[PDB]
Design a protein around this ligand. Structure first.
Ligand code: 3PE
Ligand code: LFA
Lengths: 162, 322, 470, 100, 113, 295
């Protein structure tokens, strides 16, 4: 339980670090596929079976398939991306990096001063999530379907060839 | 020496035996593809390499091992090497949750068929990566067409599964195969039967949905740049996927290993092999539809059919439970 | 918790707008008719408006672990529904010149109004999150409705990226406050603490991330820079809709969150929000000194008046009439922003110079200048009653710095508002009933502003009637 | 026996890495990637917060988070497709005409 | 228990042996066999911008697959949720089918010109 | 555009002029150096302005061929694609130019018949028939009726062979792969009869000026009877298995349709013209070789 969680977290952080510091869109997309697999391994270590299963079903199975589809649309062969590599110049990235660094310091200082007795890792089955989803969270289900409908119709209206 | 370690080693040995049997019957299903097309086309097929052609598959394995393995210089190396790996391992791991016999299962997961669904997602990743990595606009458009096809059928694959999920009441394979102890699931989930059959055929790159044989004349197949053992990896992955979808179908809709008189593994093998022969019949018989027709049948027909099937299944289940 | 028939009549507006979305969608799918879809849009919004009267007959009820309906909810739901009705009425003559598909606009308006109703009724972290996102999604739908235009497309990209970032900020704070507290109900935030350790660091940090998200959502400093770009790039009915309904709905849910939470009276949160109010008023008044365009000017005005609103917010735990002041000032805000952006919309319609407007459109110039005065806090207008209420609220709780901020910002607002007002009457070198309907809407907005600036007692009584669950 | 704090920190490095991915990148595709990093980080934080208390509320809000992820990813990618179709570039600093 | 950890180790053994078998077969394919050189060997097989309907189909799949995951969560607890959950899933299905009918009737799913 | 249609643009002279050397032995042996291969591959590269494509910045350009994994020769099509719609295309032919007319200026009257055999390699005696008919018109030769019936029989046999191959290849192009095996077995039966009568399978070269090469062997009626009772049940099975399939109908019905005007102005004959309702067949309009003695 501990080994899988820590290994998946380590390769997760390494993977997303390789995503944000890469120039090839397909290579970064593959790296974040690996990262999402790692987040789902973290979820399975924590006992959230439905959450990690769903991360590989749609988060690592549907949305980024559309991402690769758009990369296939554009055929990004490195035009106006790698010819300057301006995001690797230290005068560009050092400032925002120290911004996110002091933000991370503040966030982990807030996290480290809270109670904790550990996570027992008892599995939460998909039937309990289904019971709660169509129990006290029914408005969330229907209005999230409405949200998906709104995203669908706007993406249709904008993404047209004509 | 300890009985717990003995049981662990026996379970590991059973899993390894199952995996080796699956890959060997995938290669033997390549050989059975050739032989059964020969039988169905009023011929014999390969029958001179060994007795009855049984040593032909060794010759293809030797040839594709000792053929030159070549990665194009203009192609990206890592994605080119990676795509057949995914196309093999995704459907292999999709097999990995099938209960063949009582006491003979690799992983009695609480999810199962969900893990099959995410391996199908990995399969669409495999075809997308194989298409993009070749650096060829013919393979680019061909694999885009194939990937859109398999998306348009993987959208309702899970919803066709959901009828059997509703009847079983859980996600585990053992509960699914034990809910068919009285009546086989092919009878109530007949719409689930046809929709899952169509989705499994389309998602596994099989006729009449196989893109590299859909348009050979445009020279736009995404396998066109793949040669050597990568090509054999692609076909072994496709045939292993045929075996995987057949075993999934047997354990889902046809009662799995349950049988009146024969041992359960014999019944499982017979039902799987019957569905493999059904694959041969639909490959050799069914003509290939046009691409927009495939889009229309995937979206405007099959998905509402799965939704209505799930609604009717829920109404019947709650109505019967007073 | 199960849903009773009394609970079904409590969900009357959300159900009505959902059914209207379905009906409008099926009418679009049958035949693409612009006028029929607009007619079903306004008919459904009016049906929801009458459903608020039925809910007011029904009464107040906690309906879900999520949702809660009280007079607060009916009042803000009515404000949002009036805003969306005005948006449709102004959007039809603008859409009369659009060559592309016209019928998706009303569908997006009803979806965002449904999200605004969700946010008005929200009594949960899940309800707040889903209502915010239901507001946000068709807002990028309508801002970039004319993607052929340069300005609309860049404003759409800006709002999309910035709102997605603020959404993740709010949701991360949501996860942190759930990790600290243990329940997502509004009343249990900080209820697990007492005896002086209410200021838990993880609770405060998660709450501050939600404050960052909502401060983006109400155009608060320093998340205020998106306002003029998105306001100018978007079409004028979209500018009206975003200026009124989104701000009203998210400010109502911020009222409810800071009223119900036991940690809402924290000292550090009070100081942080006081700093945000001070900076927002001062900045959003100082930006609009030298603006030649109406839309960016109204965006900075929106930043300044949202600073005034949060000034009224900061004394909700000490004073008692803070909710009444917020309701009155939001009524004045609603009528003012429909007035200004409606005159802008009828000037910019159909799709294809405020100086010297009086010599071609005299009544439009008249409604524009009275509403320009109404935004300033000039007497005989409802905006003056709004500043009077917020200044009384700030006085009774010894918020002297924020009072001086309101005074200075109102002086700067007087400068640029009456600058535009005198620019209207200088000298410079239609024929359909829907344009007349939009003009009628802006004229009743002007008459409501004038009458409620003369006799503000009925509005005060109406807002005092709508009390929340104590 | 896994501490809740460790999962919270892990989600924090993922969130701030998504923050850098939004800020320092001029390709809008990589910016949408970074937005996905933040949203996935928030979903992971909410999952581990739910699993600490042993409740399904974290999983439900995770599902809501990924529904939002799908909607807004489609939204941003439609906007990217239209921008690349009509502008022939993906540099966002070029998309800065409005100013004031 | 012993049985569950035995099944977990069997699954891990399946994972690593499948990975090693595929990688070993690719290694054997790449290692063996002599190599050739030619001029047109490294040129591609051409025998000597495309439309965004692919994106529209994929994004359609994304949205309908998220609604499908909602149905996936519902399907495992149909009996315990009672008739009320069935009714709520019925408005869910009605909204989904109304959206699909809308997409069909506007040519969004109609690929042909 | 008056460009070369059969030969590459990098060609000198005009072959059908009387002073041109017909034989490749008169020319130098075909050297294919590195530079020659480079310029020959450069000549086959298609650039839109010369061929009249006149390229919006969205039209995808597609190349099919010149290699052609099908039975009907090898050729190239250049395609302009508005998304997935073919907006303009021009065929590229001349990849199978055998120089048959200049060859006919080289061989004698008798020796030319094997060259008329391979004009269309699915006709055989059907291709031999008009050449020997025109030669007999030149020589004033009136063939006997038995010669006419033998030539009619061989022409009909090769017509059935060609139609079987066409149906098999079309069905395989749709996607059904078994009728190609069955129809090629039927072609083997036809080839058995043709081998027995003439002595070769695809190209018999059996017609002669004024008659046929040999007399019929004893027993041809047995093989003809065997094929005649073998055929119709196989044709009915062909129809019921693939031609009445609804997927094949959806693939084929309404695809590339034209009326009588478009067929007439573009010179289309055969079933392409007869599908427009224009009843024009040579065997009935202008009867030749005693085709009027058949019902
Ligand atoms: C382990 C699981 C699998 C085991 C193997 C057994 C199952 C194999 C399943 C194979 C699935 C193949 C699906 C092919 C679908 C093609 C749909 C399509 O696009 O059809 C187009 C065609 C014409 O469409 P239209 O729009 O009318 O065209 C007008 C243009 N002139 O429209 C038509 O032709 C209309 C009819 C379309 C197809 C109807 C459904 C056919 C289902 C497949 C055959 C099943 C036979 C029994 C299998 C064994 C059962 C025990
Ligand atoms: C296509 C079929 C693939 C099957 C893969 C797994 C094979 C496992 C074989 C197990 C054999 C023993 C089964 C348990 C005992 C019952 C049967 C006894 C007689 C064989």
């Amino acid at each position: 339980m501990e080994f899988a969680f820590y290994i998946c977290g380590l390769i997760a952080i390494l993977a997303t670090l390789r995503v944000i510091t890469h120039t090839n869109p397909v290579h970064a997309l593959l790296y974040l596929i690996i990262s999402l697999l790692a987040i789902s391994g973290v979820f399975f270590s924590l006992g959230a079976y439905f959450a990690g299963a769903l991360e590989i079903i749609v988060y690592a199975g549907a949305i980024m398939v559309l991402f690769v589809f758009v990369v296939m649309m554009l055929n990004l062969g490195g035009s106006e991306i790698e010819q300057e590599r301006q995001w690797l110049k230290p005068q560009v990235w050092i400032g925002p990096a120290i911004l996110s660094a002091i933000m991370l310091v503040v966030i982990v200082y807030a996290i480290l001063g809270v109670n904790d007795q550990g996570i027992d890792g008892t599995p939460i089955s998909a039937k309990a999530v289904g019971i709660t989803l169509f129990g006290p969270y029914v408005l969330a289900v229907e209005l999230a379907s409405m949200l998906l409908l709104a995203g669908l119709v706007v993406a249709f209206h904008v993404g047209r060839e004509e | 020496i300890s009985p717990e370690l003995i049981e662990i080693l026996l379970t590991i040995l059973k899993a390894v035996v199952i995996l080796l049997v699956v890959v060997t019957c995938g290669a033997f299903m390549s050989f059975g593809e050739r032989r059964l097309l020969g039988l169905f086309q009023n011929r014999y097929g390969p029958n001179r390499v060994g007795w009855g052609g049984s040593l032909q598959l060794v010759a293809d394995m030797i040839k594709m091992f000792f053929k030159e393995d070549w990665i194009p210089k203009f192609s990206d190396r890592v994605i080119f090497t990676l795509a057949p790996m995914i196309a093999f391992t995704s459907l292999l791991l999709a097999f990995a949750i099938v209960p063949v016999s009582p006491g003979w299962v690799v992983a009695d997961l609480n999810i199962g068929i969900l893990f099959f669904l995410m391996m199908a997602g990995l399969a669409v990743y495999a075809v997308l990566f194989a298409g993009w990595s070749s650096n060829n606009k013919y393979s680019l458009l061909g694999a885009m067409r194939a990937s859109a096809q398999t998306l348009s059928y993987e959208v309702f694959l899970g919803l066709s599964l959901m009828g059997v999920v509703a009847q079983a009441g859980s996600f585990n394979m053992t509960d699914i195969v034990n809910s068919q102890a009285h009546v086989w699931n092919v009878i109530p989930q007949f719409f689930g039967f046809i929709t899952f059959a169509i989705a499994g055929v389309a998602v596994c790159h099989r006729h009449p949905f196989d893109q590299p044989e859909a348009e050979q004349e445009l020279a736009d197949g995404y396998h066109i740049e793949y040669s050597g053992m990568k090509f054999g990896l692609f076909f072994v992955g496709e045939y292993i996927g045929i075996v995987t979808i057949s075993a999934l179908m047997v354990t889902l809709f046809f009662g799995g290993w349950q049988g009146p008189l024969l041992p359960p593994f014999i019944w499982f093998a017979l039902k799987t092999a019957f569905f493999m022969m059904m694959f041969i019949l639909i490959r050799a018989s069914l003509p290939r539809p046009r691409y927009d027709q495939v889009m229309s049948f995937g979206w405007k027909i099959c998905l509402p059919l799965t939704l209505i099937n799930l609604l009717v299944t829920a109404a019947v289940i709650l109505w019967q439970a007073q | 918790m199960t849903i009773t028939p009394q609970n079904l009549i409590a969900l009357l507006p959300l159900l009505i707008v959902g059914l209207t979305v379905v009906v409008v969608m099926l009418s679009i799918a049958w035949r693409r008719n612009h006028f029929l879809n607009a007619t079903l849009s306004v008919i459904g919004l009016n049906a929801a408006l009458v459903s608020l009267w039925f809910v007011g007959q029904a009464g107040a009820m906690d309906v879900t672990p999520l949702m809660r309906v009280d007079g607060f909810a009916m009042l803000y739901t009515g404000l949002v529904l009036l805003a969306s009705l005005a948006t449709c009425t102004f959007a039809y003559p603008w859409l009369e010149g659009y060559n592309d598909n016209k019928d998706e606009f009303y569908l997006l308006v009803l979806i965002a109004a449904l999200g605004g109703i969700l946010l008005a009724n929200a009594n949960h972290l899940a309800s707040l999150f889903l209502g915010i996102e239901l507001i946000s999604l068709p807002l990028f739908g309508l801002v970039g409705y004319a993607f052929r235009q340069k300005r609309s497309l860049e404003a759409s990209i800006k709002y999309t990226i910035l709102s997605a970032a603020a959404s993740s900020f709010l949701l991360f704070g949501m996860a942190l406050v759930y990790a600290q507290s243990g329940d997502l109900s509004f009343v249990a935030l900080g209820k697990n603490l007492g005896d002086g350790m209410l200021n838990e660091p993880l609770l405060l940090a998660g709450f501050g991330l939600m404050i960052v998200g909502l401060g983006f959502k109400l155009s608060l400093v320093p998340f205020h820079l998106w306002t003029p770009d998105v306001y100018q790039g978007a079409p004028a009915p979209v500018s009206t809709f975003l200026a009124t309904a989104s701000k009203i709905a998210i400010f109502g849910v911020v009222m409810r969150l800071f009223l119900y939470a036991p940690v809402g009276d924290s000292e550090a949160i009070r100081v942080v929000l006081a700093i945000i109010a001070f900076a927002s008023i001062i900045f959003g008044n100082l930006m609009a000194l030298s603006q030649t365009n109406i839309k960016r000017l109204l965006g900075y005005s929106s930043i300044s008046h949202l600073g005034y609103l949060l000034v009224a917010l900061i004394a909700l735990q000490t004073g008692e009439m803070s909710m009444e002041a917020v309701g009155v000032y939001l009524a004045g805000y609603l009528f003012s922003s429909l007035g200004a952006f409606g005159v802008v919309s009828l000037m910019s319609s159909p799709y294809r110079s405020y100086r010297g407007l009086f010599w071609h459109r005299p009544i439009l110039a008249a409604v524009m200048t009275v509403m320009m005065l109404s935004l300033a806090g000039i007497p005989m207008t409802l905006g003056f009653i709004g500043k009077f209420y917020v200044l009384a609220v700030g006085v009774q709780a010894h918020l002297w710095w924020l009072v001086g901020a309101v005074v200075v910002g109102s002086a700067i607002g007087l400068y640029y508002y009456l600058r535009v007002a005198v620019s209207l009457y200088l000298h410079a070198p239609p024929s359909n009933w829907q344009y007349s309907a939009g003009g009628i809407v802006v004229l009743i907005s002007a008459l409501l502003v004038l009458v409620l600036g003369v006799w503000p007692q009925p509005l005060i009584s109406i807002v005092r009637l709508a009390m929340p669950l104590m | 026996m896994i501490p809740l704090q460790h999962g919270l920190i892990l989600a924090a490095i993922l969130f701030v890495l998504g923050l850098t991915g939004l800020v320092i990148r001029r390709n809008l595709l990589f910016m949408l990637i970074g937005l996905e990093i933040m949203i996935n980080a928030s979903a992971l934080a909410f999952v581990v917060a739910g699993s600490y208390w042993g409740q399904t509320d974290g999983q439900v809000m995770y599902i809501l988070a990924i529904s939002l992820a799908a909607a807004e990813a489609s939204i941003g990618l439609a906007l990217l497709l239209q921008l690349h179709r009509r502008r022939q570039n993906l540099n966002i600093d070029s998309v800065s005409e409005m100013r004031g | 228990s012993t049985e569950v950890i035995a099944h977990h180790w069997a699954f891990a053994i399946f994972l690593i042996v499948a990975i090693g078998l595929c990688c070993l077969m690719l290694v054997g394919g790449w290692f063996l066999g002599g190599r050739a050189r030619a001029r047109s060997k490294n040129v591609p097989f051409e025998s000597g911008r495309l439309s965004a309907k692919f994106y529209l189909v994929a994004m359609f799949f994304v949205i309908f697959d998220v609604e499908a995951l909602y149905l996936f969560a519902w399907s495992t607890s149909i009996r315990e949720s009672g008739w009320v959950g069935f009714v709520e899933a019925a408005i869910f299905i009605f909204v989904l089918l109304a959206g699909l009918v809308y997409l069909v009737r506007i040519g969004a799913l109609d690929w042909t010109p | 555009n008056l460009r070369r249609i059969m030969m590459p643009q990098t060609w000198k002279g005009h072959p059908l002029r009387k002073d041109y050397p017909a034989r490749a032995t008169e020319f130098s042996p075909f050297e294919l150096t590195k530079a020659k291969q480079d310029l020959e591959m450069e000549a086959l590269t298609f650039k839109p302005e010369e061929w009249g494509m006149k390229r919006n910045e969205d039209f995808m350009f597609l190349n099919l061929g010149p290699n052609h994994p099908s039975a009907h020769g090898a050729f190239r099509i250049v395609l302009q694609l508005d998304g997935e719609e073919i907006v303009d295309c021009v065929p590229d032919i001349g990849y199978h130019h055998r120089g048959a007319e200049k060859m006919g200026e080289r061989q004698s009257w008798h020796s030319y018949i094997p060259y008329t055999d391979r004009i269309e390699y699915l006709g055989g005696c059907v291709n031999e028939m008009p050449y020997v008919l025109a030669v007999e018109k030149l020589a004033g030769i009136t063939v006997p009726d038995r010669v006419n019936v033998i030539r009619v029989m061989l022409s009909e046999l090769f017509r059935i062979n060609s139609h079987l191959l066409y149906i098999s290849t079309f069905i395989q192009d749709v996607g059904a792969m078994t009728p190609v095996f069955f129809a090629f077995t039927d072609r083997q039966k036809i080839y058995d009869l043709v081998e027995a009568i003439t002595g070769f399978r695809m190209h018999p070269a059996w017609f002669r000026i004024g008659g046929v090469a040999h007399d019929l062997p004893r027993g041809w009626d047995r093989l003809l009877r065997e094929f005649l009772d073998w055929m119709p049940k196989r044709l009915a099975s062909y129809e019921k298995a693939a031609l009445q399939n609804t997927i094949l109908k959806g693939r084929s019905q309404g695809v590339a349709a034209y009326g009588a005007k478009e067929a007439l102005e573009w010179g289309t004959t055969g079933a392409g013209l007869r599908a427009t309702g224009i009843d024009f067949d040579v065997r009935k309009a202008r009867p030749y070789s005693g085709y009027e003695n058949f019902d």
